[PDB]
Subunit: 240 residues, 4 copies
Amino acid sequence: MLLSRIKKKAMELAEDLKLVDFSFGLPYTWVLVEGIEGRALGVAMTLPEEVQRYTNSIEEPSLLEFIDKADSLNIIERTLGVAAINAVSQYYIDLREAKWTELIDEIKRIAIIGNMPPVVRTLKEKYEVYVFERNMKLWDRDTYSDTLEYHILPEVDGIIASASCIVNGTLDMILDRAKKAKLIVITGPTGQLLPEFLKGTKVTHLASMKVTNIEKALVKLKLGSFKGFESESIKYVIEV
Amino acid sequence: GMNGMLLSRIKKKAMELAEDLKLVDFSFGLPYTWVLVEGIEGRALGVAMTLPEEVQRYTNSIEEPSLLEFIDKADSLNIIERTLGVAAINAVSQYYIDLREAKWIDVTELIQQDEIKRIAIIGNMPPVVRTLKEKYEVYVFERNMKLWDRDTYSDTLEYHILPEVDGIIASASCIVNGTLDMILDRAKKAKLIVITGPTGQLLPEFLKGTKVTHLASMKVTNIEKALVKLKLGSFKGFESESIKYVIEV
Amino acid sequence: GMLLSRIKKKAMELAEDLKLVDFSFGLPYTWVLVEGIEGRALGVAMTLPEEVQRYTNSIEEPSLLEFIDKADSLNIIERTLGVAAINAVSQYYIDLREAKWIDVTELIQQDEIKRIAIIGNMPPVVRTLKEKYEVYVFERNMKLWDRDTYSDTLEYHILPEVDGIIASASCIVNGTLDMILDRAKKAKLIVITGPTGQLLPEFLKGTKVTHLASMKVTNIEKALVKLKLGSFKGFESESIKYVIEV
Amino acid sequence: MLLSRIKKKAMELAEDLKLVDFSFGLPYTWVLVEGIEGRALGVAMTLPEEVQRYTNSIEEPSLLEFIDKADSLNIIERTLGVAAINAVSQYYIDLREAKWIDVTELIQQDEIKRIAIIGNMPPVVRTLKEKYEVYVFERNMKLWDRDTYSDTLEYHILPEVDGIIASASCIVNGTLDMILDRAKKAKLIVITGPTGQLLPEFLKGTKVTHLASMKVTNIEKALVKLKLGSFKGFESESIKYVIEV
């Protein structure tokens, strides 16, 4: 599992960081950390439809304990672990010259994992697009089942996968089936991880967002507002 | 919002009690949304079950969070605003709750104390269902597909079956989704109506005049340890830091 | 005291000279084909798989009277086949002389109706009314969730505040029709729209329902092919939409 | 896709067969065919939770047209196609070496330790959970348990199991290709259910070891029960078999 290798690298970076606060909440599970330079907020998308039991083996919460359960069979332990990996990453992230869609000549067929209407509408006009959605709420008249990813991914030149593919563990399959993909973009707040963690993989770019105001974003994360949390952050694209 | 709700009348009573209380912390999280409050006597933790299957959008009109702002949004069309509002009503209630005449029993024990023939169980609660299905005629209704059995009926059949039952055990989550008003209206022949679960932390005086007879809920004994488990998404961890009670209305 | 229990009693009196030809509990619609001295009639009801408890049926010997008698059953499979049979008998005897060949949107008037409750997400109807009226859309199925759609648990509280109601005819199969009419306190216009609304208007006499917006199958053979193939638009193209006043 | 290769072989066998009747219905989609020897009924499990739109490109229904749409991106076209492949298969099926046993008795303690069960089958799960290490995966929320896991974990758990009991519905949703690719250490792979009516020769070369399905003994009585939406009524008009691939 790729998430098992990412947590090993992240635990080496969490040595000088401490856990401040956390919450397995909606729409995002977040982990607040603190170092000598200041604080950092890491998030991971909560997928309640994947939750089988509301249990957690973690008795004493800590940053190293959260990161160690990132490859757990328990989705609650994974989401808190990925959020913690992102929290350590957002503390050490270098976004100096980070690019702001026009990232895609070269590409003819695109596979979009996770229904993102603004991204889909822009690409459906100029490229052959295949949208895959698992959640029934985000279903369009153009969306296909996620069971068809295994068969369509080897035929596409570009892949735009929702960063939620990291928490549900579907990232390992997406990369394995990306036989002919020249571009693989992991987009969303769950993609807050360091690009060095994905070195060697087929992932080409990471499109996420860094929290500019931790206090205001925490208020919006606790209130369950995605746009409110998004407005307290800056969107970035960094090459792996 | 929806001023016709029983929840619209409960928030009006709760806002009069939230005058000497302040908001400490909150979280729209899983399995429960919680609101932490503080008064002159100490702190109180109120919870309200999060129903993600009811969430259509992740939006919130609340810009400046406060205890009175949360309670005012209890009768909102937005489930996120309702859940945070009900958790805030429960927070205020848990600060002022008097459990002198509270019975330290299970909901199944409470039913056995009366002469019931047919029971309607709203919300699939396996321990409660298993105990009652062997001694009474039980009708289980579940809205969430995850908690669905081969013996659970659709919630659309509640409207037709509730007038035929003598007892009702409704999951306290009927307060956050807005089904409580219908359940009580259709409870024509029911002599025993129990609202069970941590979302039922509300004061019994708020349900005065309604057909609700009992409130089966739990009070947090250790706020710090229960918050750790609520943030970790562990229900039994939060349940172990609380005491279950059954109180008359 | 369900409304569907009273409709089946009236429909069984009309199914005396009709015989069952074929049937199918299928998707998107359950259908029942009947035959009389004048010819054949096809009746449909919307299959709601999310409501299915167990794939069981107490009917051993299928007949038109047996199907109609199980229209008020607790089993959704028996209800859907029963409603489809009631519609099949209705489509044989339906009189569309004074039926209006109009859309549901042009039926409502700005003169009095200020608030509209739309039960079942119908994008063309919603888009037209949302720009001129205060609209409240309620959807139970997650597949049909928009940026304006709300939960069906809020119907009980919002229906008493609306002047007009446009309810999907699927409210007849899941048994939500009885509640919708009870909570329609201030509604002056109640329209039951969809292929499940093929039942006779006389069956809804006395109720708060004002209009029935449905469709009559013009080509039974071609529509059956499209019903068996699972195509809604293919079956819709082999029918004619009508608006009949109750 | 494996279903794209199965339809090519099934279309060669549908030459002397004709379409009689069909229905995309619940619980099963069925296709009724006829040849010189008689009639055959093929079924495929309808998965309404997978249906996003109720559309079908098929204008003129035929046996070859149904089979050609078996690898379609449209679940309605796939289910009708798989039901048609099963209908052609049930006409040519040879059950001389078919075992009249349950899927549970096909597994022995001396060879298998970890079992992966795809599709929540309570009788099969209850029998195996007491003697083996079982991992149940369910995609439909209705058939979900506090003991079942998400289908996203199949990709990671399937390479660790000795045996696999997959619901034949994995053929219609399109998960069969992944299940077999992730069956790295599996010595036994059983595709169980009425959707597994297909010929064993179609799965020759694959990791699939057995096919546990059923053959309709009374077509008329089973059609009445399929149209009525009764699974047990249709099951009682059939005979369960286990044929080795």
